[PDB]
Ligand binder design. Structure first.
Ligand SMILES: Nc1ccn([C@@H]2O[C@H](COP(=O)(O)OP(=O)(O)OP(=O)(O)O)[C@@H](O)[C@H]2O)c(=O)n1
Ligand SMILES: [Mg+2]
Length: 437
RNA sequence: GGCCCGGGGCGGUUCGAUUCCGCCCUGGGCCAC
């Protein structure tokens, strides 16, 4: 049951079976045919072109090569039109760099425009160095595509796969680059156990040096960090995962963990056992793309957390959840209620000028001296986290993310108790509190 | 959109703010494929 045995069973979970390969090829063929009628230059990139896509995740990436001189606007317009006329059913919903998604003979496809250059330098559009990533990988990943699939499947099952902002994990390309560096999934896992937050992995130079932050230099452009969007905590989760896997290998590390339900009744008893203040800020989900939403939910969530900590409610952790129509910012504090009074540090008895200005203030209790300096009893405007959040969110909505803020401005409410466990956030609450089972 | 570095105007809070909470101008990088 040692590693190598597990890796064999694992291959079954990550390698596409002959039937799925068929579908992808036929779609590839058809897709080329359609493209070969309109003329137009194109290059298949990504995991389908390199035969490193994960089982049950077949998505063909076609990149339309345009002349450098063309305007950004021409790019989207032509790409849009070409995308639409080439797909059975389509859908446009770019985030910054436009592109068209669709289905050809049942397979997902991504038609993306990009400028055609020589030398991946002075990139015109944000995705220009992608075709060069394909060239560089072409002759070096050949024969290790299965090692790539194991790594992707590992990260996928543990929730740190993608590099979109929702995940802030490992991109596919990053994965491929790691296979070319260490040679296999097993070696990557073995070495990643010793990675640090200053680790720099440079495949073009076959080197590993210590830097200012986790960096995986792009062979194509040594100034771009391929793991730029990999968050620190997620880097940390992978390293820990690699350690655990080596100690007690298991096919489980490649199988997705089910949301694993819990009765909102068990959740209520846990919160009571904990004795904390658990609540959420609910508002309507802005109609924007994931890559726009999450960073905003992240800011909002953080801005409120910081409010809760400087206000002494002792926040434990924060979380957030986006559903079809609403969003939720979750919080947990050790302080369900604080006194109305508190002490505010004053000047040292020494300089009377400021002592006066300090005592000149209208106060309900009369300041005192303690260890050489004046202190005053002040009165809070709120005494619970919810009251505090309600206030802050009503007045500081503009700093809670462009769209998330404007939405909280037109409406939001604070949910807690039984009425909160009925919302679709139980998974996030359990993960946030470390509930196990 | 978010994050990092920088210039310049303000508001609030404070005994006391460049130094905490925010707002308006604006320059330069990075990420998302
Ligand atoms: N953060 C990212 C995302 C994408 N890419 C470029 O876009 C390709 C990845 O496109 P994507 O479709 O997001 O993933 P795949 O690489 O195709 O792999 P998989 O579909 O299995 O996730 C990479 O090879 C690379 O050229 C990149 O450089 N950095
Ligand atoms: Mg793909």
């Amino acid at each position: 049951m040692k590693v190598e045995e597990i890796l064999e069973k694992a291959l079954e979970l990550v390698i596409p079976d002959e039937e799925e390969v068929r579908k992808g090829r036929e779609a590839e063929e058809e897709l080329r045919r359609r493209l070969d009628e309109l003329g137009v230059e194109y290059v298949f990139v990504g995991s389908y072109a390199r035969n490193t896509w994960l089982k049950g995740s077949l998505e063909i990436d076609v990149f339309l090569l345009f002349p450098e001189e063309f305007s950004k606007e021409e790019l989207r317009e032509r790409g849009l039109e070409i995308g639409k006329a080439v797909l059975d059913s389509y859908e446009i919903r770019y985030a910054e760099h436009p592109y068209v998604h669709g289905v050809v003979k049942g397979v997902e496809v991504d038609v993306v425009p990009c400028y055609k250059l020589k030398e991946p330098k002075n990139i015109k559009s944000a995705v220009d160095r992608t075709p060069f990533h394909h060239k560089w990988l072409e002759g070096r990943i050949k024969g290790k595509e299965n090692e790539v699939r194991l790594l992707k499947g590992f990260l996928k099952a543990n929730g740190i796969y993608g590099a979109e902002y929702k995940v802030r994990g490992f991109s596919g390309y990053l994965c491929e680059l790691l296979i070319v560096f260490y040679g296999s999934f097993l070696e990557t896992v073995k070495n990643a156990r010793r990675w640090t937050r200053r680790t720099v992995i440079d495949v073009a130079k076959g080197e590993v040096r210590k830097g200012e932050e986790f960096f995986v230099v792009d062979p194509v452009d040594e100034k771009r960090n391929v793991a730029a969007n990999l968050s620190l905590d997620n880097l940390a989760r992978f390293v820990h995962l690699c350690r655990e896997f080596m100690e007690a290998p298991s096919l489980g590390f490649f199988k997705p963990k089910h949301p694993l339900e819990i009765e909102p009744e068990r959740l209520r008893k846990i919160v009571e056992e904990r004795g904390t203040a658990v609540f959420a800020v609910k508002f309507r989900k802005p109609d924007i793309v994931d890559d726009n939403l999450y960073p905003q939910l992240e800011r909002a969530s953080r801005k409120i957390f910081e409010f809760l900590e400087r206000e002494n409610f002792m926040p434990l952790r924060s979380a957030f959840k986006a559903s079809e129509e609403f969003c939720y910012l979750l919080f947990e504090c050790q302080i369900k209620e604080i006194s109305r009074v508190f002490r505010r540090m004053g000047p040292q008895f020494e300089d009377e000028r400021n002592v006066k200005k300090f005592l000149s203030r209208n106060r309900a209790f009369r300041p005192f001296i303690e260890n050489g300096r004046w202190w005053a009893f002040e009165m809070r405007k709120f005494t619970t986290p919810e009251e505090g959040v309600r206030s802050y969110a009503s007045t500081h909505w503009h700093t809670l993310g462009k769209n998330v803020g404007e939405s909280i401005r037109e409406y939001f409410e604070i949910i807690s108790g039984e009425k909160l466990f009925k919302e679709p956030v139980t998974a996030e609450l359990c993960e946030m509190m470390g509930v196990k089972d």
